[PDB]
Amino acid sequence: NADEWIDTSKIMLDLHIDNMSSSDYIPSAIDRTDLVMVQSVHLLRKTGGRGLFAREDIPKGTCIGIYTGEVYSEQEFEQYLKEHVGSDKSYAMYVGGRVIDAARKGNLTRYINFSDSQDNAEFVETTLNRKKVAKVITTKNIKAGQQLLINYNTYEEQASRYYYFLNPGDGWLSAQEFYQTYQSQYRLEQMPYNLEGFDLKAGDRVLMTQIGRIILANYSLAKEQELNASDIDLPFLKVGSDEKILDFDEADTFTPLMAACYLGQVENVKWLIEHGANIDQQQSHSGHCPLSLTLKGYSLAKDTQKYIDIIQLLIKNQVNLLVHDRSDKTFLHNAALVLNNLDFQSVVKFLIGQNPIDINEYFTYIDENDFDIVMHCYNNKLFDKALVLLAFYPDYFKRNYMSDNEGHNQFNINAFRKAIKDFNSNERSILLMQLRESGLHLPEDLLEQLG
Numbered sequence: 001n002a003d004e005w006i007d008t009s010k011i012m013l014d015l016h017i018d019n020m021s022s023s024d025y026i027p028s029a030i031d032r033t034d035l036v037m038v039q040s041v042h043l044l045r046k047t048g049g050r051g052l053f054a055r056e057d058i059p060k061g062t063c064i065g066i067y068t069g070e071v072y073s074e075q076e077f078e079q080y081l082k083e084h085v086g087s088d089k090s091y092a093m094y095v096g097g098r099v100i101d102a103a104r105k106g107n108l109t110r111y112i113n114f115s116d117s118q119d120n121a122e123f124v125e126t127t128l129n130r131k132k133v134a135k136v137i138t139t140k141n142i143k144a145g146q147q148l149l150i151n152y153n154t155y156e157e158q159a160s161r162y163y164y165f166l167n168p169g170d171g172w173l174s175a176q177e178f179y180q181t182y183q184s185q186y187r188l189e190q191m192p193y194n195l196e197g198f199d200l201k202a203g204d205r206v207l208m209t210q211i212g213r214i215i216l217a218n219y220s221l222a223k224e225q226e227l228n229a230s231d232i233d234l235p236f237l238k239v240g241s242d243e244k245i246l247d248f249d250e251a252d253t254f255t256p257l258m259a260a261c262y263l264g265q266v267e268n269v270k271w272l273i274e275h276g277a278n279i280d281q282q283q284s285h286s287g288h289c290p291l292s293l294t295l296k297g298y299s300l301a302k303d304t305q306k307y308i309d310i311i312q313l314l315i316k317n318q319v320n321l322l323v324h325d326r327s328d329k330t331f332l333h334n335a336a337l338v339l340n341n342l343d344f345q346s347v348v349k350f351l352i353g354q355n356p357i358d359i360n361e362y363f364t365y366i367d368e369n370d371f372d373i374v375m376h377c378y379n380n381k382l383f384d385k386a387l388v389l390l391a392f393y394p395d396y397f398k399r400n401y402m403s404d405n406e407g408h409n410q411f412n413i414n415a416f417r418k419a420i421k422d423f424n425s426n427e428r429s430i431l432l433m434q435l436r437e438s439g440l441h442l443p444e445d446l447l448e449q450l451g
């Protein structure tokens, strides 16, 4: 037997996997156990969650391994779920008409946690002994010690409503251990003003870096010499009433860039971005990021222009506009709600000017009500912003209602009808006027189906 030459006990000892029997670890020949390691994810400690981390720098496009597991046909797997109380699909990979369930048996790939806006790796179909399987390939350069994150390419309402928003920087250390490790970069300070956008009142104790203190004082980073860009994304660490640090799962931290965005410090935002701040960083519980926090600051401000400028900076630096809150609203969703008509138009114009490859990507994300951004505008009666979106992307109806996928087309017709179900005669005639506008070239039959 050839498996007698495979020592999975040593594989797991080398990877730091401590919650699998050796007879349940299923290696593949392309597994790069030299490049990765399994560790606890401190954020997930209350469920003993683990993750897969880079043991060294990994170049973009490197193969990590094969998603191994127990093999079922689709029918067999449904029968399994039906017969095994408490089993679920958390580890089930649907590929090639088969199901590869890594819930009980598998390899290192079973430890990669989820993100759809900060994934640095992806599942891709490959061939193995003439059958289709899933392999993991990095989609960005990974720095040693960062967690690998991957999009599961499925919808799970429980996921959007209960998962944490994981970052590549979320590791095995607690907030206490992180502070101890980098103590010389932190100083304890008292908040001198309220800051509801991060749930801080005047007088709260917070551990801050020099960069963070500069942001909170409203000083300019560019005027400072001897700034240590290493801790640019090291977080503000809140300190509890018992004078102990709040752990990562007890309170969201934030970065200097998050704060600069919320506060509208345009030049500081530019400086932070140019010095490598993760413009896609997300707070663990809330999901708030530079984009959402800029929108928040805009909602609470007399000077809205600096926030529009910050959104412009972010978009110029390839910020991920497909990030979404817990209701699966993307940035365009929520910006439709927060920005006035002129500013919403200006931001869509910025995005236009970045010349996105697939504009339709922005129009295929649906929120918890199954509304894409156009349906969303209409359901909130933002006729002007709906027209702005239609002018941005005239092909919207063509590509999402008259595609070659009749299932998708009908789902979208039904979702559009749902979005407008509460219109009165006046709103319906305004909508029909917009839709009959020459530029969309909507066929009469689709118009019938829409109203």
Ligand SMILES: Nc1ncnc2c1ncn2[C@@H]1O[C@H](CSCC[C@H](N)C(=O)O)[C@@H](O)[C@H]1O
Pocket (backbone or CB within 6 Å): 044, 048, 049, 050, 051, 090, 091, 110, 111, 112, 113, 114, 115, 162, 163, 164, 165, 166
């Ligand atoms: N972003 C996230 N926040 C919280 N839990 C997550 C998560 N991403 C993945 N998970 C957990 O991990 C499961 C996928 S298997 C991923 C490995 C798992 N964390 C483990 O230690 O075995 C999900 O069903 C969910 O329970």
Ligand SMILES: [K+]
Pocket (backbone or CB within 6 Å): 262, 263, 297, 300
């Ligand atoms: K403010």
